[PDB]
Amino acid sequence: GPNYTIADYIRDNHIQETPVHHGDPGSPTIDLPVPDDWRLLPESSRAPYGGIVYTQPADPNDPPTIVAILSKLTGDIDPAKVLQFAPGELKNLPGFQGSGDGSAATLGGFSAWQLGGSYSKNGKLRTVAQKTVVIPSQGAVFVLQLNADALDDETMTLMDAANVIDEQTTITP
């Protein structure tokens, strides 16, 4: 899309990006909570840093989910620019509609950005949101992204889980 993204920022600069997994030497420890009625997702192709899925979905083939990704950025990386370009990805979604570009936030004591809204996929309105947390540590900038997605009618399920995540997550570099 026409919006500059974090991926564009990485591509256009002398920045190395490497995926991070639980237990990797040199990486932060991120304790995400598992809200009630949600179940933990292990690390997989579809949940690179794990995630959570709602255990009482209206459509078991399309349940509300919050998936985590953790990346390690080294080189000519400015943590403030990661936050600056965080809204680009969602804003490029087909028919995305949200309240502006989102807002600043914090998670586990680190600076973050969150935006949410709706988009249309296969003729169905979906609620989507992304929280990006910048974690400068150990000669690198780690970037955590939490990607929430659900059918429009299950928007409140996502919002409830988000409050639990916002209040209980700890991040220790």
Ligand SMILES: CCCCCCCCCCCCOC[C@H]1O[C@H](O[C@H]2O[C@H](CO)[C@@H](O)[C@H](O)[C@H]2O)[C@H](O)[C@@H](O)[C@@H]1O
């Ligand atoms: C921690 C994991 C990630 C974070 C937790 C996940 C929480 C997700 C909650 C996200 C709910 C965000 O959606 C809120 C709403 O945004 C848009 O409306 C807003 O923007 C429109 C165009 O500017 C205005 O016309 C509307 O008045 C204004 O409400 C969509 O059109 C709505 O359909 C959607 O409901």
